[PDB]
Amino acid sequence: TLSAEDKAAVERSKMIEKQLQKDKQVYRATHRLLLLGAGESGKSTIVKQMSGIFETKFQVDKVNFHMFDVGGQRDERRKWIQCFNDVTAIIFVVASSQTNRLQEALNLFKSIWNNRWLRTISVILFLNKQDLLAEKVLAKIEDYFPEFARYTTPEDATPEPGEDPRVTRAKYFIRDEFLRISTASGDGRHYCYPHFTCAVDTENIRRVFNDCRDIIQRMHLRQYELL
Amino acid sequence: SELDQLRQEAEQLKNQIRDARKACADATLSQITNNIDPVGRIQMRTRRTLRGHLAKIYAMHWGTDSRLLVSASQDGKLIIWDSYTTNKVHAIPLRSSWVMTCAYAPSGNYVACGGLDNICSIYNLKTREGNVRVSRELAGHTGYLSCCRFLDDNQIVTSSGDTTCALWDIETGQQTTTFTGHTGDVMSLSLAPDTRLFVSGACDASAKLWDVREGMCRQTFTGHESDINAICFFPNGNAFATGSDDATCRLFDLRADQELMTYSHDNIICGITSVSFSKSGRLLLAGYDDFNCNVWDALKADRAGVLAGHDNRVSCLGVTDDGMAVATGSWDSFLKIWN
Amino acid sequence: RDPLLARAELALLSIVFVAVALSNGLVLAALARRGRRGHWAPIHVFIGHLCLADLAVALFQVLPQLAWKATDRFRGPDALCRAVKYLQMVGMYASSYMILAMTLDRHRAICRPMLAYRNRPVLVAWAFSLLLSLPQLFIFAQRNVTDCWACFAEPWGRRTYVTWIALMVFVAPTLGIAACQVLIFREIHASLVPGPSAAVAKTVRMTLVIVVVYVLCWAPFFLVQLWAAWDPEAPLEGAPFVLLMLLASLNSCTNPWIYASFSSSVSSELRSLLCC
Amino acid sequence: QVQLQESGGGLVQPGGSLRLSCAASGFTFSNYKMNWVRQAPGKGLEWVSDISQSGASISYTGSVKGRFTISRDNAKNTLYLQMNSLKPEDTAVYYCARCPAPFTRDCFDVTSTTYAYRGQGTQVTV
Amino acid sequence: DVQLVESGGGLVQPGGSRKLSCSASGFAFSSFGMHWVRQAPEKGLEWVAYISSGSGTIYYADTVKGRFTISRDDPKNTLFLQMTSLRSEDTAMYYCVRSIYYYGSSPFDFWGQGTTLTVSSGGSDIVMTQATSSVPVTPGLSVSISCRSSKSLLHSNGNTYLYWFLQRPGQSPQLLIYRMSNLASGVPDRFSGSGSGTAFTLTISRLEAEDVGVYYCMQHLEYPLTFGAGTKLELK
Amino acid sequence: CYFQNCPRG
Amino acid sequence: NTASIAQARKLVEQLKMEANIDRIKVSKAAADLMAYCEAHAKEDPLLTPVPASENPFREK
């Protein structure tokens, strides 16, 4: 059958498998998030409010999250972006204000949405620097976007007191700009959750938690074959 | 205005090189090999299946004894398998879970791994303490590590995403030679049988031949249309094969300095992630994104078989030194050994 | 002693035994083939465990009754009476509790998705089945020829033990299944309207099928069990009741088909082996 | 060898018109999605327009929408850009960039500092 | 450095009891199997007990079965041997031996120093035979040592489970060869192992004064593990 | 008849 | 432009250096590859499957 040394080797292998099970229990119980955005996004403020890679850990309702920030590579993403095909969500931060920064953000979002290896990852969208937008517009996007003139604020819009209609019109225009390419090829495979944040904001973590909760239901509805 | 005259020099040099290459070619490889008998159908089936990894698998490498192999996965582990009995010999945790490559030393004493952390870590397997420790960490690259290969117990060659390849001295942890000339991410490399030369494939649809000693580039090979993801010498060290994203594989020559044959089919539209030869070089193996692995007749370009047993994309494969088996890794976290 | 009635009931028992055995065997084989070819989802674990418990029900419940009613008497020793009675009650419990465990798993996975991240239920259910079947040994007193015929402990033994069994294996599980299913439907409806900024039909057609099949399969057997025991001057020792007193494991042949048809992976795996 | 050669362009008075051509070689033209990219002095690379394999889908950046028309001719492997009604802030160097992979309806790194599959550039002054 | 220190020996009356402790410091103790081997006052080695890593497997010799108990406590790196009903045949000095098993490993590589235990006076095992007991030798030439086994040690998988040890006067045994052909780490290369089946041979080339001691052959094919009588080399 | 004496019909 | 002219110059001497090698005829290289492939034909387990007696992966 087997020699004594073979039996001892099998015992060692089984001990290693026990350790691997103990590690799998930890691995399955954490959520990995990829933080991504343009250079002037202001993601430092967002991460403070909550080498090759900068990592941040936090938990809410005793649920653990990993958030990764890849900022030690070059500007070509088509090769190392494939590593993050199994994260629960992608956090996308754009600076909602020189060159047209909004268009490159839109192009990056479009490329991410349609990648053959990222066609299943949902995106959480943070539109930052609303104060900058307000103070800038109350005093040029119509030049960068000719179709802005023929835009009407949505009926279901929820304005904030002390906010000019000009600013909220700009905000929902940008949100609709992102949502137009969000839903062009969604197919129910994955969705996009937009949010409005500012420099002073302490509950973005709660929003991320709620969106991750929603993502986790649609995968279990599809895992257990109810949908 | 010297840019224009340098540009003209470059284009006329390209023209004369193309003229020399065309002059050196009269007959195609297929035309010569039109008379040899085919290899028939090649039916290979799974013999072992190694389970235990938690996430997708990027790298895999055989030992020189054709029995032990090492695999790397994105969960942060590094497992050494006994392929004859499917026994786990070692399990090594890593500091950074974003590993993209692994290598196993020819002597059998060390392993190496690296990835998005821009660090190549050397692990000692024969310590007196009984565990596995980190011996050296090699820093100096400014991009992710994509491949690494040992020359002996003291020298290692790495290719990174900063468009450079470097030669290290493990004892002192310093770069002795730096290879430059690529314009895109260097994705893979292969060492020559005599360990005098090596080739690298990058994301500019070009492959280069390097000399280890003087740090000089001998030849540059073109012909692909997109990024190159894999490369491997022919057994005798006078040819190599590349797999790209344009759904083709190609065979180059070192002495005629040009393309020889293209391995493509009309109904294949996905990229290639790994290539490897057999012991006699008659069979060329390639891993695709459509979850399969085709087997090509290297001398006739006719497909000869399929290894369809994986659920996700195939990310790595390799052939033992004695040619008894071939192993394939995949993004479903399983290794299979075919024979 | 009627030979014709004995022959008919033996035929019925054989039919139900072969049906449940073949169904559970084929489903478990398809499940094993799917499992060895990749990863097995948590739904597969529970459907396989239910099929295994159902096969146990078959082997350890229908067969002893089959042989006993064939011989028309028991030729074995007294302890065998207690063991057989125990081994044919344990399955009756195990099937229902596997169904309940599956439904509870689904409810946990849908209504509390993060609670799984903040094999116990199936093992707990097997344990409850073994513990609950213990009073059987005391009840089956010494045979006084046939196996433990006319066996009891107290005057209320034949009026309260039966009803307690009826409750614990018929009323609580169906109420639990209905409650969990309506909670799942309510959570899906609540989460469907807001959208990101269909399955309701499948959920409804699952709840209706499950509940009506369970109730319809369990109704006649326990109805006659109550009439025979709770009601004195039992109305029939005649041909009608002989068949109904012996179809306790009717739903043992219907739930694997239900949970293979509603699922798509297992249905595809089984239909792949249709032509083989 | 992937090689893109660009022609046309020059000095034109404001309000004028121009036509740009980009001859491609060394790859199957019809399988790839082509772009146009410009780079103003003292500024970074910016994206202008793109076109699908056949020509069904066309996109434009906001600042030039309504004045620029992009077209391709798969028969002779040529990409075009018809610029008319120019403006002083349109002076830059223009490149034609191929998306990295075939049979793919998105592409990542076209507007990068050192991209392998874009041309040499033509200068347009106004 | 690897260090195995052990204590608990002394004088004891027949039929009593005593506990022996082995303190391990300098290596990953929880990954190693552990053996107990005892040295009779003027005899050869003898295997006693074995406990695997994780305490999932325990074996005993026939002579001490039922009276001796072996246990380990991983958190504080200590190995215990509990002895009950001591007899006069147990007077010996006991060794603590470490061992790790995987493909290509080298078991029985490190030995303790030993504790002396003195007790006041009141069938299918493989037989390993070392016929020669003493060999007179001068430095410079080559020597050969022969060991023979009752049963063939060549397993089906191709390994041959035979080991060689050397014990200098007044020191612990030290591993030389494992599995008939493999040199231990930190061992001069003038030693060589050879053999086939049931006949075995160990060769020393260019002998020096440092190679003076007793040499034992051990089989590891089946439990219990059995040693040889031992062959002594005398310096002229 | 699984938990009560079977009517011996 | 200094970086541009520097890299253009480096490319220029690189093409100087690469365009001075000696190339052999293609048919000769094809014949050499074919000869090597046929010479080592016997020692290729994958090309010609070995009997299941000495196959290390035969048990299952």
Side-chain angles (χ1 to χ4, degrees), chain B residues 178-195:
Chain B
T178 315
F179 308 90
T180 43
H182 272 308
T183 50
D185 292 331
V186 192
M187 290 297 318
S188 76
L189 57 89
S190 183
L191 273 175
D194 51 28
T195 309

PDB file of all heavy atoms in Angstrom, chain B residues 178-195:
ATOM      1  N   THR B 178      21.239  46.525 -16.930  1.00  0.00           N
ATOM      2  CA  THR B 178      19.890  46.969 -17.251  1.00  0.00           C
ATOM      3  C   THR B 178      19.710  46.973 -18.761  1.00  0.00           C
ATOM      4  O   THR B 178      20.535  47.537 -19.486  1.00  0.00           O
ATOM      5  CB  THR B 178      19.617  48.361 -16.686  1.00  0.00           C
ATOM      6  OG1 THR B 178      20.101  48.434 -15.341  1.00  0.00           O
ATOM      7  CG2 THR B 178      18.130  48.650 -16.696  1.00  0.00           C
ATOM      8  N   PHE B 179      18.637  46.346 -19.228  1.00  0.00           N
ATOM      9  CA  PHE B 179      18.344  46.247 -20.649  1.00  0.00           C
ATOM     10  C   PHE B 179      17.228  47.217 -21.003  1.00  0.00           C
ATOM     11  O   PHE B 179      16.152  47.181 -20.398  1.00  0.00           O
ATOM     12  CB  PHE B 179      17.945  44.821 -21.024  1.00  0.00           C
ATOM     13  CG  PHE B 179      18.917  43.778 -20.561  1.00  0.00           C
ATOM     14  CD1 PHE B 179      18.775  43.182 -19.324  1.00  0.00           C
ATOM     15  CD2 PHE B 179      19.970  43.390 -21.364  1.00  0.00           C
ATOM     16  CE1 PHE B 179      19.664  42.223 -18.898  1.00  0.00           C
ATOM     17  CE2 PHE B 179      20.861  42.431 -20.942  1.00  0.00           C
ATOM     18  CZ  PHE B 179      20.708  41.848 -19.708  1.00  0.00           C
ATOM     19  N   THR B 180      17.484  48.077 -21.984  1.00  0.00           N
ATOM     20  CA  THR B 180      16.544  49.109 -22.387  1.00  0.00           C
ATOM     21  C   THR B 180      16.380  49.095 -23.898  1.00  0.00           C
ATOM     22  O   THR B 180      17.283  48.687 -24.632  1.00  0.00           O
ATOM     23  CB  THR B 180      17.009  50.495 -21.937  1.00  0.00           C
ATOM     24  OG1 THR B 180      18.415  50.625 -22.178  1.00  0.00           O
ATOM     25  CG2 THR B 180      16.740  50.690 -20.460  1.00  0.00           C
ATOM     26  N   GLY B 181      15.220  49.554 -24.357  1.00  0.00           N
ATOM     27  CA  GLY B 181      14.946  49.612 -25.778  1.00  0.00           C
ATOM     28  C   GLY B 181      13.504  49.329 -26.138  1.00  0.00           C
ATOM     29  O   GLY B 181      13.045  49.708 -27.219  1.00  0.00           O
ATOM     30  N   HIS B 182      12.776  48.665 -25.249  1.00  0.00           N
ATOM     31  CA  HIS B 182      11.353  48.458 -25.458  1.00  0.00           C
ATOM     32  C   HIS B 182      10.597  49.758 -25.222  1.00  0.00           C
ATOM     33  O   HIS B 182      11.068  50.655 -24.518  1.00  0.00           O
ATOM     34  CB  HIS B 182      10.821  47.370 -24.527  1.00  0.00           C
ATOM     35  CG  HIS B 182      10.924  45.988 -25.091  1.00  0.00           C
ATOM     36  ND1 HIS B 182      10.445  45.656 -26.339  1.00  0.00           N
ATOM     37  CD2 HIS B 182      11.443  44.850 -24.574  1.00  0.00           C
ATOM     38  CE1 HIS B 182      10.668  44.376 -26.568  1.00  0.00           C
ATOM     39  NE2 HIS B 182      11.271  43.863 -25.512  1.00  0.00           N
ATOM     40  N   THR B 183       9.416  49.858 -25.823  1.00  0.00           N
ATOM     41  CA  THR B 183       8.582  51.043 -25.689  1.00  0.00           C
ATOM     42  C   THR B 183       7.258  50.766 -24.994  1.00  0.00           C
ATOM     43  O   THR B 183       6.474  51.697 -24.796  1.00  0.00           O
ATOM     44  CB  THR B 183       8.318  51.662 -27.063  1.00  0.00           C
ATOM     45  OG1 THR B 183       7.872  50.645 -27.967  1.00  0.00           O
ATOM     46  CG2 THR B 183       9.583  52.293 -27.608  1.00  0.00           C
ATOM     47  N   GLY B 184       6.991  49.517 -24.619  1.00  0.00           N
ATOM     48  CA  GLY B 184       5.776  49.170 -23.915  1.00  0.00           C
ATOM     49  C   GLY B 184       6.074  48.243 -22.755  1.00  0.00           C
ATOM     50  O   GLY B 184       7.229  47.910 -22.485  1.00  0.00           O
ATOM     51  N   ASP B 185       5.010  47.830 -22.075  1.00  0.00           N
ATOM     52  CA  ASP B 185       5.152  46.926 -20.944  1.00  0.00           C
ATOM     53  C   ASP B 185       5.764  45.611 -21.405  1.00  0.00           C
ATOM     54  O   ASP B 185       5.276  44.990 -22.352  1.00  0.00           O
ATOM     55  CB  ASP B 185       3.791  46.664 -20.303  1.00  0.00           C
ATOM     56  CG  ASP B 185       3.225  47.884 -19.613  1.00  0.00           C
ATOM     57  OD1 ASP B 185       4.016  48.723 -19.140  1.00  0.00           O
ATOM     58  OD2 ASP B 185       1.985  48.004 -19.540  1.00  0.00           O
ATOM     59  N   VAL B 186       6.826  45.178 -20.736  1.00  0.00           N
ATOM     60  CA  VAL B 186       7.432  43.886 -21.041  1.00  0.00           C
ATOM     61  C   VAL B 186       6.639  42.812 -20.311  1.00  0.00           C
ATOM     62  O   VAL B 186       6.494  42.858 -19.087  1.00  0.00           O
ATOM     63  CB  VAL B 186       8.911  43.855 -20.645  1.00  0.00           C
ATOM     64  CG1 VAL B 186       9.581  42.638 -21.235  1.00  0.00           C
ATOM     65  CG2 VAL B 186       9.599  45.114 -21.115  1.00  0.00           C
ATOM     66  N   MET B 187       6.121  41.843 -21.060  1.00  0.00           N
ATOM     67  CA  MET B 187       5.147  40.912 -20.511  1.00  0.00           C
ATOM     68  C   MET B 187       5.716  39.541 -20.187  1.00  0.00           C
ATOM     69  O   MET B 187       5.202  38.876 -19.283  1.00  0.00           O
ATOM     70  CB  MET B 187       3.975  40.748 -21.482  1.00  0.00           C
ATOM     71  CG  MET B 187       3.096  41.979 -21.600  1.00  0.00           C
ATOM     72  SD  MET B 187       2.263  42.451 -20.074  1.00  0.00           S
ATOM     73  CE  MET B 187       1.730  40.860 -19.453  1.00  0.00           C
ATOM     74  N   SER B 188       6.752  39.091 -20.890  1.00  0.00           N
ATOM     75  CA  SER B 188       7.314  37.777 -20.620  1.00  0.00           C
ATOM     76  C   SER B 188       8.712  37.688 -21.206  1.00  0.00           C
ATOM     77  O   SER B 188       9.105  38.493 -22.053  1.00  0.00           O
ATOM     78  CB  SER B 188       6.431  36.663 -21.189  1.00  0.00           C
ATOM     79  OG  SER B 188       6.588  36.564 -22.590  1.00  0.00           O
ATOM     80  N   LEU B 189       9.462  36.693 -20.740  1.00  0.00           N
ATOM     81  CA  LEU B 189      10.796  36.426 -21.256  1.00  0.00           C
ATOM     82  C   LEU B 189      11.070  34.934 -21.169  1.00  0.00           C
ATOM     83  O   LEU B 189      10.402  34.208 -20.430  1.00  0.00           O
ATOM     84  CB  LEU B 189      11.873  37.212 -20.500  1.00  0.00           C
ATOM     85  CG  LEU B 189      12.010  37.044 -18.987  1.00  0.00           C
ATOM     86  CD1 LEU B 189      12.946  35.907 -18.638  1.00  0.00           C
ATOM     87  CD2 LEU B 189      12.518  38.325 -18.380  1.00  0.00           C
ATOM     88  N   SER B 190      12.063  34.485 -21.931  1.00  0.00           N
ATOM     89  CA  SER B 190      12.464  33.087 -21.954  1.00  0.00           C
ATOM     90  C   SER B 190      13.977  33.008 -22.041  1.00  0.00           C
ATOM     91  O   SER B 190      14.599  33.782 -22.772  1.00  0.00           O
ATOM     92  CB  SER B 190      11.827  32.349 -23.131  1.00  0.00           C
ATOM     93  OG  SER B 190      12.163  30.975 -23.105  1.00  0.00           O
ATOM     94  N   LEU B 191      14.566  32.081 -21.294  1.00  0.00           N
ATOM     95  CA  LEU B 191      16.008  31.905 -21.264  1.00  0.00           C
ATOM     96  C   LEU B 191      16.444  30.846 -22.266  1.00  0.00           C
ATOM     97  O   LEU B 191      15.755  29.846 -22.482  1.00  0.00           O
ATOM     98  CB  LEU B 191      16.469  31.513 -19.863  1.00  0.00           C
ATOM     99  CG  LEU B 191      16.747  32.666 -18.904  1.00  0.00           C
ATOM    100  CD1 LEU B 191      17.065  32.133 -17.528  1.00  0.00           C
ATOM    101  CD2 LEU B 191      17.892  33.508 -19.421  1.00  0.00           C
ATOM    102  N   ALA B 192      17.599  31.073 -22.879  1.00  0.00           N
ATOM    103  CA  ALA B 192      18.140  30.138 -23.847  1.00  0.00           C
ATOM    104  C   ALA B 192      18.619  28.866 -23.156  1.00  0.00           C
ATOM    105  O   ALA B 192      18.909  28.871 -21.959  1.00  0.00           O
ATOM    106  CB  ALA B 192      19.289  30.782 -24.613  1.00  0.00           C
ATOM    107  N   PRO B 193      18.685  27.750 -23.888  1.00  0.00           N
ATOM    108  CA  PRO B 193      19.213  26.518 -23.278  1.00  0.00           C
ATOM    109  C   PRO B 193      20.630  26.656 -22.753  1.00  0.00           C
ATOM    110  O   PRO B 193      20.948  26.104 -21.693  1.00  0.00           O
ATOM    111  CB  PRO B 193      19.126  25.506 -24.427  1.00  0.00           C
ATOM    112  CG  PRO B 193      18.018  26.011 -25.272  1.00  0.00           C
ATOM    113  CD  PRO B 193      18.141  27.503 -25.233  1.00  0.00           C
ATOM    114  N   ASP B 194      21.494  27.385 -23.459  1.00  0.00           N
ATOM    115  CA  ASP B 194      22.869  27.565 -23.014  1.00  0.00           C
ATOM    116  C   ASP B 194      23.027  28.709 -22.024  1.00  0.00           C
ATOM    117  O   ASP B 194      24.138  28.922 -21.525  1.00  0.00           O
ATOM    118  CB  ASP B 194      23.789  27.792 -24.216  1.00  0.00           C
ATOM    119  CG  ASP B 194      23.288  28.885 -25.142  1.00  0.00           C
ATOM    120  OD1 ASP B 194      22.584  29.801 -24.671  1.00  0.00           O
ATOM    121  OD2 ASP B 194      23.603  28.827 -26.348  1.00  0.00           O
ATOM    122  N   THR B 195      21.953  29.447 -21.745  1.00  0.00           N
ATOM    123  CA  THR B 195      21.960  30.552 -20.789  1.00  0.00           C
ATOM    124  C   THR B 195      22.981  31.620 -21.194  1.00  0.00           C
ATOM    125  O   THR B 195      23.702  32.177 -20.364  1.00  0.00           O
ATOM    126  CB  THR B 195      22.204  30.037 -19.365  1.00  0.00           C
ATOM    127  OG1 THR B 195      21.286  28.972 -19.098  1.00  0.00           O
ATOM    128  CG2 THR B 195      21.914  31.115 -18.341  1.00  0.00           C
TER     129      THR B 195
END
